[PDB]
């Protein structure tokens, strides 16, 4: 949980899985220049039924623009070392002395709404009332590469702080 490629914002669990934190500055010519600047704040494991923990990796905001070009590859490269545990990269957004309007308290987790998955976007909320209780919200897609199979932990991820029935 120690070593190298962060700017030293530590948590007590970084290195038991993460050769990407130690030795992908060694197996990369230019992902060397990509992973080495990046930070992440903290790591929470969250139990979903089956002894199945999701790791809420608190990546900051300035590590999403080029990180989208490696999130297609890295979410299964910790599925190559530890299994029946899961990696989900979350970002942190402003709650809105003097406070503005734009990204207030639910628009905080409106960009923590699409960012369970990538890259197929959204189609809209479908919120049920007496079955604001179960809160349907759907997507439309072009492809399926991290939607439609790991979503049944993502159901338990979101609605405490795009609910996961999607007809392709």
């Amino acid at each position: 949980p120690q070593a190298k490629i962060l700017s030293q914002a530590p948590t007590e669990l970084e290195l038991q899985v993460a050769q990407a934190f130690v030795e992908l500055e060694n197996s990369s010519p230019e992902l060397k220049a990509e992973l080495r600047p990046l930070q992440f704040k903290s790591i929470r494991e969250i139990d979903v039924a089956g002894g199945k923990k999701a790791l809420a990796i608190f990546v900051p905001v300035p590590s999403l623009a080029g990180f989208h070009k490696v999130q297609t590859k890295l979410t299964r490269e910790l599925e190559k070392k530890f299994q029946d545990r899961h990696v989900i990269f979350l970002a942190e957004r402003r709650i809105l002395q003097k406070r503005p309007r734009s990204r207030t308290l639910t628009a905080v987790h409106d960009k923590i709404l699409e960012d369970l998955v990538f890259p197929t976007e959204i189609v809209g909320k479908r919120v049920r009332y007496l079955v604001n209780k179960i809160q349907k919200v759907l997507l439309d897609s072009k492809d399926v590469q991290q939607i439609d199979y790991k979503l049944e932990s993502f159901q338990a991820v979101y609605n405490k702080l795009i609910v996961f029935e999607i007809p392709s």
Binding site: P119, T120, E121, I122, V123
Partner: protein, 150 residues
């Protein structure tokens, strides 16, 4: 429901749910921003910019893949227009009507068609004095509604 026209109309630009660049367009935001900056230094009105080079270079809009809208673009460049895009071309309509007003004197609908354009320029000058993008000392006038476009 139209003002000043008494008709019904739908001139459509509708937008579906998804916000970000969905499926196929492979450029970064910097590429389309520098494309719009290339377009902006050509020195034309933002209507003429969009109508050509949203249509000839695969640009979707100037807000979805770009992020900064066009009048925000030009004010970060030093080429922000005097009176932005629409009040100018409504003064251009006033130019056309007032130059036809003295081709022939008794074109009586031209007296009626200037009033509607003049009224909409009054509303636009008043709204642009509201949010303080027009300076509130100058007032729109017919003695400046034919020497300010051409």
């Amino acid at each position: 429901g139209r003002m000043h026209s008494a008709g019904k109309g739908i001139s459509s630009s509708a937008i579906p749910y998804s916000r970000n660049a969905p499926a196929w367009f492979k450029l970064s935001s910097e590429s389309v921003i520098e494309q719009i900056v290339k377009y902006a230094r050509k020195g034309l009105t933002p209507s003429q910019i969009g109508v050509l080079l949203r249509d000839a270079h695969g640009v979707t809009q100037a807000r979805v893949i770009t992020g900064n809208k066009i009048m925000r673009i030009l004010k970060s460049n030093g080429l922000a227009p005097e009176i932005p895009e629409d009040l100018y071309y409504l003064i251009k309509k006033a130019v056309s009507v007032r130059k036809h007003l003295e081709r022939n004197r008794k074109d009586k609908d031209a007296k009626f068609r200037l009033i509607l354009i003049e009224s909409r320029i009054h509303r636009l000058a008043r709204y642009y004095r509201t949010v303080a993008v027009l300076p509130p000392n100058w007032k729109y006038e017919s003695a400046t509604a034919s020497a300010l476009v051409n």
